[PDB]
């Protein structure tokens, strides 16, 4: 309930302060690259879970509901995070500050997913996506992706929409440019969903092909 009482500015500050840190990897042939990404994603998950608890409204949910939303959107949230920090590196994917990759090394296994991620990064760059907008998109993903598999969550989603509009009216966008940019941002979420689904079935085929985290096995064997 407390989340619905926030101002737009208080909503923005809450999400910004909730931002998880940028992690480093263990500093490429096949299985080695997958090990690094698995190791990195495993450690990132621990931060995401705590980040999720800082998203206004998320704490007000049943534990089983919190579990379900995270099980649904964990890879989406990882990918939009990857795409976000890869913005200022055109044609490259910044998995970690010490792990920057282009589509070349990602051919050892995956090429299709990299190109989609790079496409999203190019889309963010072209749109000139702001950090305030990014943290709103990410929290939307957390609350929306598993909401059908609930009225309160929809009240919070509306709240984040108001926040997004508030941000855009602040930057000097006309009312028309406000609903247009809103639409553009939310339509990218369909592709981020698409990338997650494609990445998920790749991990599924990888799991029963043989290692990975016991936590990551939760997220898979529940999806």
């Amino acid at each position: 309930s407390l989340a619905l009482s926030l101002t737009a500015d208080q909503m923005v500050s809450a999400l910004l302060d909730a931002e998880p840190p940028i992690l480093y990897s263990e500093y490429f042939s096949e299985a080695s690259m997958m090990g690094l990404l698995t190791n990195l994603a495993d450690r990132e998950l621990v931060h995401m879970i705590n980040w999720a608890k800082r998203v206004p409204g998320f704490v007000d949910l049943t534990l089983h509901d919190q579990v379900h939303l995270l099980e649904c959107a964990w890879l989406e949230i990882l990918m939009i995070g990857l795409v976000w920090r890869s913005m200022e590196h055109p044609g490259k994917l910044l998995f970690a500050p010490n792990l920057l990759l282009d589509r070349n090394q990602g051919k050892c296994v995956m090429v299709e997913i990299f190109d989609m991620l790079l496409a999203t990064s190019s889309r963010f760059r072209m749109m000139n996506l702001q950090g305030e907008e990014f943290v709103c998109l990410k929290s939307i993903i957390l609350l929306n992706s598993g909401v059908y598999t609930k009225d309160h969550i929809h009240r919070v989603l509306d709240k984040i929409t108001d926040t997004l509009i508030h941000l855009m009216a602040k930057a000097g966008l006309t009312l028309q440019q406000q609903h247009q940019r809103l639409a553009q941002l939310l339509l990218i979420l369909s592709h981020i969903r698409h990338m997650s689904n494609k990445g998920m079935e790749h991990l599924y085929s990888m799991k029963c092909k043989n290692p990975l985290s016991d936590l990551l096995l939760e997220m898979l064997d529940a999806h």
């Binding site: 621990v46 879970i49 534990l63 919190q66 579990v67 099980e71 936590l215 939760e218 997220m219």
Partner: peptide
Amino acid sequence: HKILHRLLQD
């Protein structure tokens, strides 16, 4: 239970 359960409580 799930490992995710205790992560959300700790």
